């Protein structure tokens, strides 16, 4: 049994069922004997009785089994349009995992490289992350013909954000919406990292059992790399509630991590033939590589811009006698270095604020706290009320703070602020739009997913990125440097 209490630990890699758009035969390491098979093997391949215990060559034929052996470390081999003993044509997916050979058969519907080259040429010239992700949903929708294409980007806390959308006009928008980390369990994230493609042909389809589900040793069949692997009844119910019959996800791998997903949703059943899936997988790899380079370039540009800005400031600092007056006149210009909603200067026990900052009365408390925990280093939090409980009252204005010491001797600081994340939301969805529910209740709806995320990030700001902290550290050295020169 699986429910909302234990679905976070569901063993989705060993479901004991496949989807009905293909059939599955499990053989031993050397593909000599047939150990397991899907119940629908009889109907599709045209066989009678139990296949378990019979030889590989006896079931498929000496001709086919020889080709399968030649094809055989963990990445599945795609063999489109293969012929059986009785002439029937099938698309075959072959892989070996935990010293078990798994063979998947699809009714053949026969140019992967041709489709992929067209798609990859149209994204290769993109000169920004924004331009790449914007055109991709549009392009994938037009080429693959799904009713909705989304891109999810994973936050530091595992939450997903919808950062791009192409949809049918009549469908509701999820653009700028967040879902909590729990909506995609750890075991699901692990499989998304191992398989480029994940296909759900028909959410309402009857799943086909694998026989036997457990062998005599008490071992289930690991379907981690099987494209026919059946899906969790929790996710099934989620899709049914949304009016989604079919899905296909493409994993976005950046710097060997799961950056996010390209997800295609359809309102009617839909499976792509093996050749179209090979093309989509190749597009996924190229999209991932191009995004990785564009991310690297944006980081370089951001830090080069910060260096240029700090050099401009050091030049002015050499021509001003009173450094303190220059900081009072200039501090707001440091807002261009690090994305923030407000910035402040704490110098000679005097406060100067710009944009969204805590109230004037709250600053001395904040300054004393920073002085005690900083230890002459950059100090940052995205959850100010977890550090100072009475900061809760002004969380709408300033929920996050990054502190930069600007003196090696005195307790003078340059303070950067961010509003709580819900204040910066740009959501294009319909709040009136409601969803039909199943046995499990309204937990499995976009509406409730978004409400749970909003609760989890209350009194919290957008976290300070690795790039934000790198620029802050370079700014500390620059300002502490000139402050020493002027002593």
Ligand X SMILES: *C/C=C1/C(=C/C2=NC(=C\c3[nH]c(/C=C4/NC(=O)C(C=C)=C4C)c(C)c3CCC(=O)O)/C(CCC(=O)O)=C2C)NC(=O)[C@H]1C
Residues engaged in binding its own copies (CB under 8 A): 113, 117, 120-121, 124, 282, 285-286, 289-290, 292-293, 296-297, 300, 303-304, 307, 408, 470, 473-474, 477-478, 480-481, 484-485, 487
* Residue 281 interaction partner, one of ligand X, Cl ion, its own copies, none, beta carbon < 5-8 Å per kind: none
Is residue 329 at the binding interface for ligand X, with CB under 6 A as the rule?
A: no
Work out which of 183, 341, 412, 420 binds ligand X, going by CB under 6 A: 183
426 near Cl ion (CB under 5 A): no
Binding test (CB under 6 A) with ligand X, winner from 221, 253, 263, 362: 263
Of 132 and 236, CB closest to ligand X = 236
408 binds, among ligand X, its own copies, Cl ion, none (CB under 5 to 8 A by kind): its own copies
Contact call for residue 238 and ligand X (CB under 6 A): yes
> Is residue 207 involved in binding ligand X (CB under 6 A)?
no
- Closest approach of its own copies to the CB of residue 73, in Å: 9
Q: What would the x/- binding string for ligand X be over residues 217 to 236, using CB under 6 A?
A: --------------xx-xx-
User: Smallest distance, Å, CB 180 to ligand X?
Assistant: 8
Min separation Cβ 5 and its own copies, Å: 41
The interface partner of residue 360, options being ligand X, Cl ion, its own copies, none and the CB cut-off 5 to 8 Å by kind, is: Cl ion
Write the interaction track for ligand X spanning residues 117-156; mark x where CB under 6 A is met and - where it is not. ----------------------------------------
> CA–CA separation, 185 vs 345, rounded Å?
43
In this chain, which residue has its C-beta nearest to ligand X?
7
- 319 is a contact residue toward Cl ion (CB under 5 A): no
Please identify, using beta-carbon distances, which residue of 4 and 425 lies nearer to ligand X.
4
Using the rule CB under 6 A, give the single segment among 3-11, 309-317, 405-413, 458-466 that binds ligand X.
3-11
Point out which span in 42-50, 138-146, 167-175, 360-368 binds Cl ion (CB under 5 A). 360-368
Quick one: 50 or 121, whose CB is closer to its own copies? 121
Please state the three-class secondary structure of the chain as a single string. Answer: CCCCCCHHHCCCCCCCEECCCCEEEEEECCCCEEEEEECCHHHHHCCCCCCCCCEHHHHCCHHHHHHHHHHCCCCCEEEEEEECCCCCEEEEEEEEECCEEEEEEEECCCCHHHHHHHHHHCCCCCCCHHHHHHHHHHHHHHHHCCCEEEEEEECCCCCEEEEEEEECCCCCCCCCCEECHHHCCHHHHHHHHHCCEEEECCCCCCCEEEECCECCCCCECCCCCCCCECCCHHHHHHHHHHCCCEEEEEEEEECCEEEEEEEEEECCCCCCCHHHHHHHHHHHHHHHHHHHHHHHHHHHHHHHHHHHHHHHHHHHHCCCCCHHHHHHHHHHHHHHCCCCCEEEEEECCEEEEEECCCCHHHHHHHHHHHHHHHCCCCEEECCHHHHCHHHHHHCCCCCEEEEEECCCCCCCEEEEEECCHHHHCCCCCCCCCCCCCECCEHHHCHHHHHHHHHHHCCCCCCCCCHHHHHHHHHHHHHHHHHHHHCC
Binding site for ligand X (CB under 6 A): 4, 7-8, 10, 12, 174, 179, 182-185, 188, 198, 231-232, 234-235, 238, 247, 249, 263, 443-444, 446, 449
Binding site for Cl ion (CB under 5 A): 359-360
């Amino acid at each position: 049994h699986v429910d909302l209490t234990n679905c976070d630990r569901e063993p989705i890699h060993i479901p004991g069922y496949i989807q009905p758009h293909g059939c599955l035969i499990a053989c031993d390491n050397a593909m000599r004997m047939v150990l397991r098979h899907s119940e629908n093997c009889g109907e599709l391949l045209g066989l009678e009785g139990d296949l378990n215990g019979r030889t590989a060559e006896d079931v498929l034929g000496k001709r086919l089994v020889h080709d399968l052996r030649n094809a055989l470390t963990t990445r599945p081999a795609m063999l489109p349009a293969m012929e059986t003993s009785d002439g029937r044509s099938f698309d075959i997916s072959l892989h070996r995992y935990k010293s078990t050979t798994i063979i998947e058969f699809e009714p053949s519907d026969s140019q992967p490289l041709g489709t992929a080259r067209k798609m990859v040429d149209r994204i290769r010239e993109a000169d920004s992350v924004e331009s790449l992700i914007s055109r991709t949903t549009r392009l994938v929708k037009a080429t693959l013909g799904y009713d909705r294409v989304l891109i999810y980007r994973f936050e530091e806390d595992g939450a997903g954000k919808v950062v791009s959308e192409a949809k049918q006009p009549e469908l509701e928008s999820f653009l700028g919406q967040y879902f909590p980390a729990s909506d995609i369990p750890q075991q699901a994230r692990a499989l998304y990292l191992k398989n480029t493609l994940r296909i759900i042909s028909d959410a309402s389809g009857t799943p086909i059992p694998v026989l036997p589900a457990v062998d005599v040793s008490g071992e289930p069949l690991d379907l981690s790399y099987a494209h026919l692997r059946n899906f969790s009844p929790i996710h099934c119910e989620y899709l049914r509630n949304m009016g989604v019959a079919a899905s296909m996800s493409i994993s976005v791998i950046v710097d060997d991590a799961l950056w996010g997903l390209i997800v295609c949703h359809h309102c009617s059943p839909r499976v792509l033939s093996m050749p179209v899936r090979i093309a989509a997988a190749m597009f996924g790899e190229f999209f991932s590589m191009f995004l990785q380079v564009l991310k690297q370039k944006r980081r370089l540009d951001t830090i080069n811009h910060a260096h240029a800005a700090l050099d401009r400031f050091l030049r002015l600092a050499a021509h001003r006698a009173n450094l303190e007056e220059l900081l009072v006149d200039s501090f707001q210009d440091f807002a261009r270095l690090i994305p923030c909603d407000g910035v402040g200067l704490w110098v000679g026990n005097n406060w100067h604020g710009h944009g969204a900052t805590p109230p004037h009365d709250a600053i001395p408390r904040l300054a004393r706290f920073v002085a005690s925990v900083s230890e002459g280093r950059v100090w940052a939090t995205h959850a100010l009320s977890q550090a100072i409980p009475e900061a809760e009252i002004y969380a709408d204005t300033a929920a996050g703070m990054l502190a930069i010491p600007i003196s090696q001797v005195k307790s003078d600081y340059l303070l950067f602020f961010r509003k709580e994340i819900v204040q910066n939301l740009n959501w294009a969805g319909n709040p009136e739009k409601s969803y039909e529910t199943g046995p499990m209740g309204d937990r499995l709806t976009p509406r409730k997913s978004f409400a749970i995320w909003k609760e989890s990030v209350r009194l919290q700001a957008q976290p300070w990125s690795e790039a934000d902290r790198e620029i802050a550290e370079t700014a500390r050295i620059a300002l502490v440097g000139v402050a020493f020169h002027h002593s």
